[PDB]
Amino acid sequence: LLGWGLKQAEEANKTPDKPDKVWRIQAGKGFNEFPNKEYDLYKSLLSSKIDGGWDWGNAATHYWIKGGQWNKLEVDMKDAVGTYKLSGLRNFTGGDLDVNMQKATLRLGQFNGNSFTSYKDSADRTTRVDFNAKNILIDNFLEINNRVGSGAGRKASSTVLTLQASEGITSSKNAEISLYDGATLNLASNSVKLNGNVWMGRLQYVGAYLAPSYSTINTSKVTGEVNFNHLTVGDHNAAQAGIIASNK
Amino acid sequence: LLGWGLKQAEEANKTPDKPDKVWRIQAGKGFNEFPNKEYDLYKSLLSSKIDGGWDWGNAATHYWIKGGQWNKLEVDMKDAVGTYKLSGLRNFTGGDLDVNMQKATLRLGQFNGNSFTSYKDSADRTTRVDFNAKNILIDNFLEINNRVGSGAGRKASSTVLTLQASEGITSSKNAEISLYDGATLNLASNSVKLNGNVWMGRLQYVGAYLAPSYSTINTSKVTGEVNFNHLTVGDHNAAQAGIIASNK
Amino acid sequence: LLGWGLKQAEEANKTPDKPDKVWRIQAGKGFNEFPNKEYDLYKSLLSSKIDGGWDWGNAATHYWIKGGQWNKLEVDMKDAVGTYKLSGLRNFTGGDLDVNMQKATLRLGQFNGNSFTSYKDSADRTTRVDFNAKNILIDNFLEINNRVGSGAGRKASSTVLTLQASEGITSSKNAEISLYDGATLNLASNSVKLNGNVWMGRLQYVGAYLAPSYSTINTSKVTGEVNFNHLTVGDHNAAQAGIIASNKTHIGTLDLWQSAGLNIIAPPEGGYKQKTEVQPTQVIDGPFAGGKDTVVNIDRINTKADGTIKVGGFKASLTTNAAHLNIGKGGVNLSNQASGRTLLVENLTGNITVDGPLRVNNQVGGYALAGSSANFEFKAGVDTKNGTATFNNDISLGRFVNLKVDAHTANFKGIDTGNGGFNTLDFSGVTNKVNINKLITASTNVAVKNFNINELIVKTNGVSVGEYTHFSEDIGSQSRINTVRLE
């Protein structure tokens, strides 16, 4: 009921969280010399300190970092060369990623999209899912702060996606980007062309027609070209989104 | 998932409930000599052993008989003469009425319709709301096994309306009869002309598009003329109602 | 919120209570041979198995029978002779007295009145304070179901006084009988003359202006003469009392409040006569009719109207099933507040015979302000529809006062509205005859369906225009005016 002028404003200057267990996976040699190999990145690197599981009751999958949903995973590459697909990183609840990939190419989907969800605990934490790639190349759909399963279970709090490409972000034609009730999106790239469905705000739940559902695509640091194709806000509710662009 | 061939069949031959506190209000003299007076019946008789209240959380009103929703109220008139409106008996949860009104005229609405709801306790009891009037004359809308408030709170189990007029039942033009997920309706009258909206099955809840919602209008004992005008089954679900008529 | 038609009806056929410790004090010899001795009865007999005490917090005294407020005290005299004062039996909570005093004289006050209060426990018990005297002779004030102390503490539930004199009950002049929120009073005597203040319903608490406060004086078994002097119902609340009399009633002054109710109800034409658990049969009745020789001889109807301002009136009202309603020579008075006060003199199965001057602010003319529409109202024969509202005395309507009669045959002797004007002189309920014998109109709204107003005065009203004698509805077939005089 506060409005996006207030609901986004409370989340501008925050400390990230209180994470213990700061895992520091350093991908050393081997990855640093194959520019065209098409690594998977979820399995050839990241499934070591990311454990899946089952959320007992109304789940498809269940993910965190390590031992509860309040532990940081930081990856220190800064010189790894190649290209990396995710292809199915779905219902990642987790918290405090920063996949730091200088001179590395990303892909967030190959036959399967991704997800970066939060949980509504007693602390109400933002997951702060970060990326630091060179070309991100969304290429399949991405759902940020999506519904975990069907209504019940551990509810989804606010969450943040942050992207730090340095050379460009495209998106696929049917890459339905649909970020929800608390989900944001920062960008630090240029030539942003989200050429598929961009869907700010939706029914997070099938019966919540009274959803405030303030979302944000905070592209305030885009140094180049912004372009959408299909911006569709509002679905059976008062979905009042917002965009802080970069003056074009 | 059982289907109305099974879901109605489990409720054919049941004991009513286990009611303690069998209240026996006998309306004696005074009522027995004014054929045209237009009594109210909820207030001039029935509000004595029916206590209202508040359901703490998502309610409009709150009703039972006396001290919890598991007590019987029986009324022994059998010779009272006159006419009786209800005009607002809404969110009556209660249980085990049998308003026995020989040679008495009824009305179930005057500027305000009624309701006869159940609760989903650990016993899963049918309220067995009975009537034994001479002319019932619905005349405003009636919602049986309706949603109590908005979704949450004490859920609504199956319930039964039973009517035993002996001379006729009409209904008003906008008298939207909409009985829901477990609600039935027996009749023992004749010249049944439910000339308004008859609505078997609906979304009991705003997000329950997967509702089975088997309802019934068991007019198996109508000795005369059956007539509807607007029979509308199904609302965003697989509402599979049924009717056991009386061979016409 | 149930109303006295329900609130009294739940207490008709009840088991008394569940009392243990049934004390049986038998006053033997000694008491049985002094007819004129003037015993005290509280101290020479009854203080043995009645223990006083202190209610810790907001009390004056504290009383019960023996060891908690749920024990019976029964006294078995049946032949004791003499006279017995109480003189101070106050804040008796107790429960289940029946002081059985055949051929014995009582007195309920001598320099000090009495009290018979209840407690609101988890059982909500009626104390059933009984008496079985020969002459009771109230003689000082008595407060039944009074406030115990000041607001807090153990609250007062419903309670019952029952009296069974066999020869007579008087009362003193300042014997302010004021029974409250649940208090009743049965009588089985004759020649009842409660010649002091009789006060049904009051603020039981000083801040409870929203008090329902249904009380009862159920004199249904009085075989002789009923008489009040000062019947005053209503005190800053909707005190809606009731009386079930014994087919003859005279009251004196009726000082009703703004929003007071009253249900003077006669006897009928034939008069009066785990495990599943079966509750007993609760016999309840609708509003029936009083018998043939059933008369309500009210001789004054006043109004106590002050305090706050509501957007309508307040409608002090009575109700009668008796075959007549003879409102005597004091007639009708009405104190007028800023808003427009209302007076429902309803009679279900009878007539309305007002033989008195209809005053307002204690004057007959009674001019009123703009917002104040003093809506006098009468309903003669609602459910029988042969009820005449006869005003055998000349009425006079001043300004912003509104006679309306909804009867079967509204007889009159003269209606004077034109001096003050602005009179909605409605007669819409009146079936056939509105037999007005004289009419004064200057600025009136006389809407009569059928009449024979055999004299007509149509006055002027100065320089004010648009204001005139106004037959605003159908005049009909059998209409008649035997004299028109345009002045």
From Swiss-Prot, chains A, B:
Organism: Helicobacter pylori
Source domain of life: Bacteria
Parent-protein start and end of this portion: 60 to 307 of 1287
Disulfide bonds: none
Biological role: Induces vacuolation of eukaryotic cells. Causes ulceration and gastric lesions.
Gene: vacA
Protein name: Vacuolating cytotoxin autotransporter
Record remark: domains: The signal peptide, cleaved at the inner membrane, guides the autotransporter protein to the periplasmic space. Then, insertion of the C-terminal translocator domain in the outer membrane forms a hydrophilic pore for the translocation of the passenger domain to the bacterial cell surface, with subsequent cleavage.
Swiss-Prot record, chain C:
Gene this protein is translated from: vacA
Described function: Induces vacuolation of eukaryotic cells. Causes ulceration and gastric lesions.
Name of the protein: Vacuolating cytotoxin autotransporter
Residues represented out of the complete protein: 60 to 581 of 1287
Source domain of life: Bacteria
Record remark on domains: The signal peptide, cleaved at the inner membrane, guides the autotransporter protein to the periplasmic space. Then, insertion of the C-terminal translocator domain in the outer membrane forms a hydrophilic pore for the translocation of the passenger domain to the bacterial cell surface, with subsequent cleavage.
